[PDB]
């Protein structure tokens, strides 16, 4: 049943889209010392999962911030400076976010190829015998 | 027996529902860019039951909207439209073969 | 289409605004009694389902 392939590729494409949006936010918030409520932005990362026990769909199970320390900068005249004159900025690393942009896009496009190829195989089964 | 219902089965009601689903899916694709528009889903099991003898379901977004309010995930809509077209083609083949077999028996050809 | 186009567009638009804010300070280096304006970025999460 190739219709299962559609579920797996669709779940993979959804997972890559979540990863791409996470990368988009990290690049946009790699220079933000402030935040909406009260907590400095930390590089977010989606968590993929495989519930192996046919096909095993890939599901995103939540967003987890990176555990790297916040990059402290000496801005003593800044309003938000601490007692030592340090301000903290998000731990977003440019090199790894660019790799995620490349990896997520290439992984997204190859799952479309599988679904398109799997779509053809179902059609040829319909034409079998006639 | 010897009736069109008992002969065609559920392949006549299924075709109508599959065309209904394609109208719903195409609506979501067209209304993807309209802000405030909520993606519309269709229950096949309930629709088939209603068709055989005879409410609004919304699709939960995977990610928050960027402010417009539109919850249409165009990646999912294309995938569902592709699946709906394949299953609709099978239903036409299933329903079309019901008439061909009936004509074959009533004429012995 | 993916809402990441607008997520990145909204960041690129704001980076231009901060660039203009820094440009006014450099245009006002010789101005008398001029206090330079500070520029920063704020992260505002899109709370909702998903």
């Amino acid at each position: 049943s190739l219709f299962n392939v559609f579920n797996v590729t669709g779940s993979a494409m959804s997972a890559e889209s979540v990863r791409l949006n996470t990368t988009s936010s990290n690049l946009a918030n790699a220079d933000s010392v402030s935040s909406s409520a009260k907590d400095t932005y930390k590089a977010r990362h989606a968590v993929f999962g495989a519930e192996l026990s046919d096909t095993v769909p890939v599901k995103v199970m939540g967003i987890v911030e990176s555990d790297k320390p916040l990059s402290a900068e000496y801005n003593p005249d800044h309003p938000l400076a601490n007692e030592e004159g340090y301000i903290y900025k998000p731990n977003v690393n440019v090199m790894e976010e660019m790799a995620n942009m490349i990896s997520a896009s290439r992984a997204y496009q190859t799952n479309v190829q599988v679904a398109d190829s799997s779509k053809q195989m179902l059609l040829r089964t319909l034409q079998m015998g006639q | 027996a010897i009736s069109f219902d008992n002969a065609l089965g559920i392949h006549q009601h299924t075709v109508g529902v599959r065309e209904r689903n394609a109208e719903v899916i195409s609506t979501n694709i067209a209304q993807a860019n309209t802000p405030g528009y909520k993606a519309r889903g269709l229950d096949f099991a309930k629709e088939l039951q209603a068709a055989t003898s005879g409410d609004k379901l919304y699709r939960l977004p995977t990610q928050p909207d960027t402010g417009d309010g539109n919850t249409v995930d165009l990646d999912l809509e294309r995938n569902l439209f592709m699946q709906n077209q394949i299953r609709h083609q099978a239903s036409l083949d299933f329903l079309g073969s019901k008439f061909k077999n009936l004509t074959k028996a009533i004429k012995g050809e | 289409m993916d809402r990441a186009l607008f997520l990145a567009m909204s960041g690129a638009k704001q980076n231009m605004q901060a660039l203009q804010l820094r440009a006014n300070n450099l245009a006002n280096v010789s101005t008398t009694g001029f206090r330079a304006d500070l520029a920063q970025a704020r992260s505002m999460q899109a709370y909702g389902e998903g």
């Binding site: 909406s36 | 909520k38 919304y58 699709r59 909207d65 960027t66 | 505002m44 899109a46 709370y47």
Partner: peptide, 19 residues
């Protein structure tokens, strides 16, 4: 996933305390 209640609109507040 399908539901009967329409999905809620996102907020994106400038300041969370203001709400």
């Amino acid at each position: 996933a399908l539901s009967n209640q329409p999905p809620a609109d996102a907020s994106i507040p400038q300041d969370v305390a203001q709400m």
